[PDB]
Design an enzyme around this catalytic site. Structure first.
Site, PDB file in Angstrom:
ATOM      1  N   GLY A  38       0.809  -1.198   0.000  1.00 53.05           N
ATOM      2  CA  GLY A  38       0.000   0.000   0.000  1.00 53.05           C
ATOM      3  C   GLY A  38       0.846   1.252   0.000  1.00 53.05           C
ATOM      4  O   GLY A  38       2.081   1.209   0.054  1.00 53.05           O
ATOM      5  N   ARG A  39       0.145   2.381  -0.075  1.00 53.47           N
ATOM      6  CA  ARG A  39       0.771   3.691  -0.099  1.00 53.47           C
ATOM      7  C   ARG A  39       0.142   4.571   0.968  1.00 53.47           C
ATOM      8  O   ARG A  39      -1.039   4.429   1.302  1.00 53.47           O
ATOM      9  CB  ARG A  39       0.621   4.390  -1.469  1.00 53.47           C
ATOM     10  CG  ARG A  39       0.661   3.463  -2.668  1.00 53.47           C
ATOM     11  N   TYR A  42       2.869  10.076   2.752  1.00 59.19           N
ATOM     12  CA  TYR A  42       4.298  10.330   2.818  1.00 59.19           C
ATOM     13  C   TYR A  42       5.115   9.043   2.760  1.00 59.19           C
ATOM     14  O   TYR A  42       6.312   9.063   3.066  1.00 59.19           O
ATOM     15  CB  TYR A  42       4.611  11.109   4.101  1.00 59.19           C
ATOM     16  N   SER A  43       4.510   7.928   2.367  1.00 60.38           N
ATOM     17  CA  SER A  43       5.146   6.646   2.623  1.00 60.38           C
ATOM     18  C   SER A  43       4.669   5.608   1.619  1.00 60.38           C
ATOM     19  O   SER A  43       3.659   5.783   0.935  1.00 60.38           O
ATOM     20  CB  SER A  43       4.856   6.183   4.058  1.00 60.38           C
ATOM     21  OG  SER A  43       3.463   5.998   4.253  1.00 60.38           O
ATOM     22  N   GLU A  44       5.425   4.527   1.544  1.00 58.42           N
ATOM     23  CA  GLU A  44       5.014   3.317   0.858  1.00 58.42           C
ATOM     24  C   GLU A  44       5.213   2.172   1.833  1.00 58.42           C
ATOM     25  O   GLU A  44       6.154   2.190   2.632  1.00 58.42           O
ATOM     26  CB  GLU A  44       5.824   3.091  -0.439  1.00 58.42           C
ATOM     27  CG  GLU A  44       5.433   4.061  -1.538  1.00 58.42           C
ATOM     28  CD  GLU A  44       5.951   3.650  -2.909  1.00 58.42           C
ATOM     29  OE1 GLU A  44       7.002   2.971  -2.988  1.00 58.42           O
ATOM     30  OE2 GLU A  44       5.290   3.999  -3.906  1.00 58.42           O
ATOM     31  N   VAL A  45       4.324   1.189   1.787  1.00 57.16           N
ATOM     32  CA  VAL A  45       4.336   0.101   2.753  1.00 57.16           C
ATOM     33  C   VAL A  45       4.527  -1.198   2.006  1.00 57.16           C
ATOM     34  O   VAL A  45       3.840  -1.446   1.014  1.00 57.16           O
ATOM     35  CB  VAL A  45       3.038   0.037   3.586  1.00 57.16           C
ATOM     36  CG1 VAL A  45       3.197  -1.027   4.672  1.00 57.16           C
ATOM     37  CG2 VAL A  45       2.748   1.377   4.174  1.00 57.16           C
ATOM     38  N   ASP A 148      -5.875   9.976  14.077  1.00 61.66           N
ATOM     39  CA  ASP A 148      -6.282   9.430  12.786  1.00 61.66           C
ATOM     40  C   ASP A 148      -7.006   8.105  12.973  1.00 61.66           C
ATOM     41  O   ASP A 148      -6.754   7.134  12.248  1.00 61.66           O
ATOM     42  CB  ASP A 148      -5.081   9.267  11.835  1.00 61.66           C
ATOM     43  CG  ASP A 148      -5.502   9.232  10.377  1.00 61.66           C
ATOM     44  OD1 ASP A 148      -6.704   9.447  10.107  1.00 61.66           O
ATOM     45  OD2 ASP A 148      -4.641   8.987   9.503  1.00 61.66           O
TER      46      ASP A 148
HETATM   47  C1  LIG Z   1      -1.471   1.448   3.502  1.00 63.17           C
HETATM   48  C2  LIG Z   1      -1.241   0.201   4.351  1.00 63.17           C
HETATM   49  C3  LIG Z   1      -0.737  -0.946   3.766  1.00 63.17           C
HETATM   50  C4  LIG Z   1      -0.517  -2.096   4.503  1.00 63.17           C
HETATM   51  C5  LIG Z   1      -0.833  -2.095   5.842  1.00 63.17           C
HETATM   52  C6  LIG Z   1      -0.635  -3.258   6.799  1.00 63.17           C
HETATM   53  C7  LIG Z   1      -1.309  -4.486   6.445  1.00 63.17           C
HETATM   54  S1  LIG Z   1      -0.985  -5.544   7.546  1.00 63.17           S
HETATM   55  C8  LIG Z   1      -0.117  -4.802   8.640  1.00 63.17           C
HETATM   56  N1  LIG Z   1       0.433  -5.183   9.782  1.00 63.17           N
HETATM   57  C9  LIG Z   1       1.180  -4.278  10.494  1.00 63.17           C
HETATM   58  N2  LIG Z   1       1.371  -2.978  10.052  1.00 63.17           N
HETATM   59  C10 LIG Z   1       0.836  -2.604   8.882  1.00 63.17           C
HETATM   60  S2  LIG Z   1       1.205  -0.917   8.336  1.00 63.17           S
HETATM   61  C11 LIG Z   1       2.676  -0.451   9.287  1.00 63.17           C
HETATM   62  C12 LIG Z   1       2.242   0.113  10.639  1.00 63.17           C
HETATM   63  C13 LIG Z   1       2.020   1.623  10.628  1.00 63.17           C
HETATM   64  O1  LIG Z   1       2.055   2.294   9.563  1.00 63.17           O
HETATM   65  O2  LIG Z   1       1.804   2.191  11.733  1.00 63.17           O
HETATM   66  C14 LIG Z   1       0.092  -3.488   8.196  1.00 63.17           C
HETATM   67  C15 LIG Z   1      -1.335  -0.940   6.429  1.00 63.17           C
HETATM   68  C16 LIG Z   1      -1.550   0.205   5.696  1.00 63.17           C
END
Ligand SMILES: Cc1ccc(-c2csc3ncnc(SCCC(=O)O)c23)cc1
Ligand SMILES: [Cl-]
Length: 331
Positions: A38-39, A42-45, A148
């Protein structure tokens, strides 16, 4: 305007001084990127791997831009580490030459709320909302506003009955009387305080957002308040809570709507919460559920339940009683 709880946390404590934080970077080579998930703004995940441990993780790469926001998010995650149902920050790392930093988190095998929430039962909602209240009571008790709260930021591994509150990139330390940016939270979950430029808000902003999620859950209506823009958002709230309570909230807090916004709001009677009941959601709605919701969705942020008070509400009686019985049996 000052909070009814926890005003004294960042005033009786380097704790909230995130601008001066010095990050103890880890080794970027410890984590590898496998898949984009995901996006953010300010970030990409990404999903990644801890190459030493071989365990799954989440890798959030933050555009090297906005260094004070990076340190605020790191500071808040480190202060909350170990708290109940807070996403775990495992590490912070960065290239070395490119500077770009990466936040490394536990992986939650979540189901996206859009598919999960229509499958939730009455019991599931009481259970998961209680789990989320544990996270908000904790972070509020540490003097932190999330700002948020929304289903996108609540990761639920439904098979593990496991919940994590994520994305602390807008979170902030509460200081009594401080004025805060009102350009926080996401449109459908913004509290009245934000929509009418009340800047000295507090933790109770998170309880409005929770009330929005809860109303979306029990009424199967996501989002519950569906504004087409930030002005229409307040209009959509006014069509439910009514304009009488609004103009009294405005009166109490020395606020005046832009004549153009006041026109858009118009005049509306308070609607009863029973209006949102239908044959497809009736099994999720009880007098307790409505009473809890009514105590969260109030214009006056000072009049909303705190997270601690919410956990004490009758709607959660069976959830508390189940924990008590299990603890008694296990002992
Ligand atoms: C845009 C997005 C994409 C993937 C995920 C996600 C799926 S499972 C999962 N399990 C733990 N963390 C995350 S996000 C990292 C934590 C944070 O930004 O505070 C995710 C969460 C948000
Ligand atoms: Cl990388």
């Amino acid at each position: 305007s000052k909070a009814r709880v926890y005003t004294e946390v960042n005033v009786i404590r380097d704790y909230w001084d995130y601008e001066s934080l010095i990050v103890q970077w880890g080794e970027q080579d410890d984590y590898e990127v496998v898949r984009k998930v995901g996006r953010g703004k300010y970030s990409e995940v990404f999903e990644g791997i801890n190459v030493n441990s071989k365990e799954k993780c989440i890798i959030k790469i933050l555009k090297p831009v906005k260094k004070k926001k990076i340190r605020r998010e790191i500071k808040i995650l480190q202060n909350l580490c170990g708290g109940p149902n807070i996403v775990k920050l495992l590490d912070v790392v960065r290239d070395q030459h490119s500077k770009t930093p990466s936040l490394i988190f536990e992986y939650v095998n979540s189901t996206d709320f859009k598919v999960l929430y229509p499958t939730l039962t009455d019991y599931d909602i009481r259970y998961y909302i209680y789990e989320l209240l544990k996270a908000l009571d904790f972070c509020h008790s540490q003097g932190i506003m999330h700002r948020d709260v929304k289903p996108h930021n609540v990761m639920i591994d439904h098979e593990l009955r496991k919940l994590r509150l994520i994305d602390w990139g807008l979170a902030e330390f509460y200081h009594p009387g401080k004025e805060y940016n009102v350009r926080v939270a996401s449109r459908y979950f913004k509290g009245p305080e934000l929509l009418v430029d009340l800047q000295d808000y507090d933790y109770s902003l998170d309880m409005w957002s929770l009330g929005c999620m809860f109303a979306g859950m029990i009424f199967r209506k996501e989002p519950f308040f569906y504004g087409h823009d930030n002005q229409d958002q307040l209009v959509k709230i006014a069509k439910v809570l009514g304009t009488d309570e609004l103009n009294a909230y405005l009166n109490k807090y020395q606020l005046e709507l832009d004549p153009q916004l006041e026109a858009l709001v118009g005049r509306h009677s308070r609607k009863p919460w029973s209006k949102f009941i239908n044959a497809d959601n009736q099994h999720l709605v009880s007098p307790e559920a409505i009473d809890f919701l009514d105590k969260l969705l109030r214009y006056d942020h000072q009049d909303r339940l705190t997270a601690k008070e919410a956990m004490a509400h009758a709607y959660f009686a069976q959830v508390r009683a189940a924990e008590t019985s299990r603890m008694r049996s296990q002992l």
